[PDB]
Amino acid sequence: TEVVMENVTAFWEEGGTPVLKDINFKIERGQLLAVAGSTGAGKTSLLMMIMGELEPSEGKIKHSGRISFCSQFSWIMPGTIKENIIFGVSYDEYRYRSVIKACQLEEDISKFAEKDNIVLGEGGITLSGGQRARISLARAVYKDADLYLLDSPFGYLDVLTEKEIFESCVCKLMANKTRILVTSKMEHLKKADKILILHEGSSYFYGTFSELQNPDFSSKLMG
Ligand SMILES: Nc1ncnc2c1ncn2[C@@H]1O[C@H](COP(=O)(O)OP(=O)(O)OP(=O)(O)O)[C@@H](O)[C@H]1O
Ligand SMILES: [Mg+2]
């Protein structure tokens, strides 16, 4: 047991409608949990709760450990690509190199004369959205953390790159890590240990891929 939610309900608006209603799950160390559902279902809000940014109105959240969060929206601080990835933490050569490879940043870095020492301005608006997204993922995965919260880290990448990085980073590099991945792709759900499908704040499904089927679930993963 590393993350537990029991009977969790929450409101952003003090007197409005619940953003999450009666959420239940448990994640054990090293497991991959897929959190799926359409726009507005409550996926990011669920992560906010784990991070203590959204307090429950009822129920219990039990988690132990340092969180590393990859936001749905990429961000870039003033500094080099290297400094953005390392982000405070001490530099470990092997760790750094493996993350850069897993997030396909080798080819990008090589194209600048200053390499990963190129200086970016706040927002990194001279880079592409894909480049910023892969740096933001690299930043999250480089961190020594107990719980990795990855909020749609491939939403600004093409389908092939998404497949490749899901494999190289989430599946291979992070194989021993406790991961919560916001994603609705069938391939990703198939590889997850557990799946939570949210629909309009509620738990539409919680369980394994084999349970999911044996019916119309896939319609609830879209939009
Ligand atoms: N950090 C935040 N602070 C305040 N309100 C938020 C925050 N994140 C989400 N909300 C609000 O909570 C509600 C639930 O939406 P949420 O962002 O959790 O859905 P989601 O499943 O992440 O959607 P998407 O797939 O579009 O990213 C929305 O009304 C949203 O405006
Ligand atoms: Mg979201």
Residue ranges of the domains in the chain? 1-223
User: SS3 for 29?
Assistant: coil
Token reading at 87: 């982000």
Q: What resolution in angstroms does the PDB record give?
A: 1.8
Q: Pocket residues for ligand 1 (CB within 6 Å)?
A: 12, 19, 37, 39-45, 48, 72
Query: Which residue, among 129, 35, 147, 125, has the nearest Cα to 73 in the 3D structure?
Result: 129
Q: Is 37 annotated as a binding residue?
A: yes
3-state secondary structure of 38: coil
Q: Angle, to 10 degrees, between the axis of helix 93-102 and the axis of helix 129-142?
A: 140
Q: Minimal CA–CA distance to 189: which of 170, 203, 174?
A: 170
Cα separations in angstroms, 205 against 10, 41, 189, 196, 216: 18, 13, 12, 6, 11
The approach used to solve this structure was X-ray
Query: 221: Cβ–Cβ under 8 A, 6 or more apart, which residues?
Result: 36, 37, 38, 184, 185, 186, 189, 197
Which residue has a Cα nearest atom 27 of ligand 1? 39
Q: What's the half-sphere exposure (Cβ side, CA atoms, 13 Å) at 60?
A: 4
| Protein residue with least CA distance to atom 7, ligand 1 | 45
Probe target for ligand 1 pocket from 19, 23, 44, 72, with the most ligand atoms within 8 Å of CB: 44
> Known binder of ligand: residue 43?
yes
- From ligand 2's centre to the CA of 124, what distance in Å? 22
Ligand nearest to the CA of 38: 1
Residue nearest to atom 9 of ligand 1 (CA): 45
Determine the CATH number of domain 1-223.
3.40.50.300
Strands, DSSP E only, in the chain?
A: 3-10, 20-27, 32-36, 58-63, 67-70, 79-80, 119-120, 147-151, 179-182, 194-199, 202-207
Locate the ligand 1 atom nearest the alpha carbon of residue 40 and give its number: 19
Q: Are 36 and 197 in contact (CB under 8 A)?
A: yes
Residues 41 and 200: beta-carbon distance below 8 Å: yes
Sheet holding 20-27, edge to edge: 58-63, 3-10, 20-27, 202-207, 194-199, 32-36, 179-182, 147-151, 67-70
The label of the residue with tokens 């007197």 reads: 15
Of 133, 64, 142, 132, which is closest to residue 100 (Cα–Cα)? 142
